Structures are given as C-alpha cells and as structure tokens.
C-alpha cells in the first residue's frame, strides 16, 4: 500500500454582513 | 382502604409564573450549556428567555 502526500489550507468564510431584524438591547 | 389521599408525582403548585415576551429581543450570542445543565436549568431559561 503506497504512501501519499497531501495538503490543505484554511478556507475563507468571509460572508458579507447579515441583516438581522432583531435588536439586542432597549 | 379508604382513598383518603391522592397519590401523585411531580406535584403542581397553586401559583405559577406567567410571562409575556417582546419577541424582537434576542441576544446575538448563543449559550452552549452541557446537556445535564440544560436538563436542570433548561425549563427555567426557556421560560425567562
């Protein structure tokens, strides 16, 4: 069973900012 | 025997908390309690949300 190399890099997860209609304080 | 009493479990009380919510208020952050702490504290937190 042959050895194998591999790789990875951290993904972007930059969503454009969400528009909540709920408010968090008075 | 005479049925002098009424055996019951998890008794219901005379007073209970009623609660009105304003449903537009929610914390953006989300708590993550352990399952057991949710089993204990949970009905309370769900009521006084």
């Amino acid at each position: 069973k042959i050895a194998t190399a591999s790789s990875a890099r951290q993904a972007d997860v930059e969503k454009p900012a969400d528009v909540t209609f709920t408010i968090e304080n008075v | 025997l005479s049925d002098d009493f009424k055996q019951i479990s998890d008794p219901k009380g005379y007073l209970t908390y009623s609660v009105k919510y304003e449903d537009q208020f929610t914390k953006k952050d989300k708590l993550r309690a352990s399952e057991a702490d949710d089993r204990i504290v949970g009905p309370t937190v769900n009521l006084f949300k």
Binding site: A17, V19, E24 | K28
Partner: protein
Amino acid sequence: ISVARSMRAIVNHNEVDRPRGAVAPSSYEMDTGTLSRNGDLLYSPVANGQVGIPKLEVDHISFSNVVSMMTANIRTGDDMAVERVNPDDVRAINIRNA
C-alpha cells in the same frame, strides 16, 4: 528557501524526543497583544516594566490580533429623507449677498 515555513515535522520521535530539524511556530504567531493608546496593534510586554512593541514595527508575522467590529450591521435601512420646499416666487428670490 524555507522562509515561509512556520512549523516543520509535526510527528513524534520516540514518543517524546523531537526529530532533529523540526520547527515549532515562533511565539509571535500566538501573541494577540492589545490595541495601543492610539489604537495600533501591539505585541504583549516582554519584561513587566516595558511597553509592548507594535506588531507593524517588527518583521514577525502574528496570527492572533484584536479587531474592532460593529456588533451588528451598520445599514439599518432607515435612510434619511427630507422635506424640500421650493421658493414661493422666483422673482422674489435673493441672489445677492454672497
């Protein structure tokens, strides 16, 4: 050549000893210090008495930092609107005086 290298040989040697030539990440990758008085990023103080060196000031890369951010979206959607009201009579308008 290996100038972009941060960590090298993430494997054990005899379940304790490090392999010769394995590289732990530099400490600066993990500093996440603080904002300066003006708001610049800074590494944490080294000696207790000295102030922390700004992260831009030195050549080290640093992968944890304090970013300021709004708690929720700035564009609430209540855009400003106005009541323009016209001059009553065009002849009476005062062009003069600056």
